[PDB]
Design a protein around this nucleic acid. Structure first.
Ligand code: K
Ligand code: MG
Ligand code: MG
Ligand code: MG
Length: 134
RNA sequence: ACAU
DNA sequence: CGATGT
């Protein structure tokens, strides 16, 4: 199996897990950063991975692009397929922001359509995803 | 076990 | 070493 170079790759970065969460999307071929989310004070790795995919979907749909999205997160890929982020993170004042973003991402999935293939980046074969936070 |  | 997830 070969890398689909005409694609968008996304990844999360964090300081702590749970901790400060950010994510970005890059052109898989060139590494050009196409979007980056301002750090969110408290979230989980998987919430960030999920938000990154959904933002990718919205970014590609707005631009009428049929490119696939790569993510290395088995969890987030499934959450997007289910349109449901099954996170364990407590809901409190500290986590309100990330939970609002997650709820709104689910809502977007439940009110829009897309054909974008969401593909597993095969880290064991190909190395780190091109959006990785080194 | 697998993926982060 | 710890945590998030299927
Ligand atoms: K585990
Ligand atoms: Mg990742
Ligand atoms: Mg990474
Ligand atoms: Mg890392």
């Amino acid at each position: 199996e070969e890398i689909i170079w005409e694609s968008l790759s996304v990844d999360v970065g964090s300081q702590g897990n749970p901790g400060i969460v950010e994510y970005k999307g890059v052109d898989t071929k060139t590494g050009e950063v196409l979007f980056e989310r301002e750090p969110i004070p408290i979230g989980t790795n998987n919430m960030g991975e999920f938000l990154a995919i959904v933002h990718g979907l919205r970014y590609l749909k707005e631009r009428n692009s049929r490119k696939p999205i790569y993510s290395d997160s088995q969890t987030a890929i499934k959450w997007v397929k289910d349109k449901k982020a099954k996170s364990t993170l407590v809901r409190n004042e500290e986590t309100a922001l990330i939970w609002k973003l997650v709820d709104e991402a689910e809502e977007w999935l439940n009110t829009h359509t897309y054909e974008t293939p969401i593909l597993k980046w095969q880290t064991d074969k190909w190395g780190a995803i091109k959006a990785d936070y080194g």
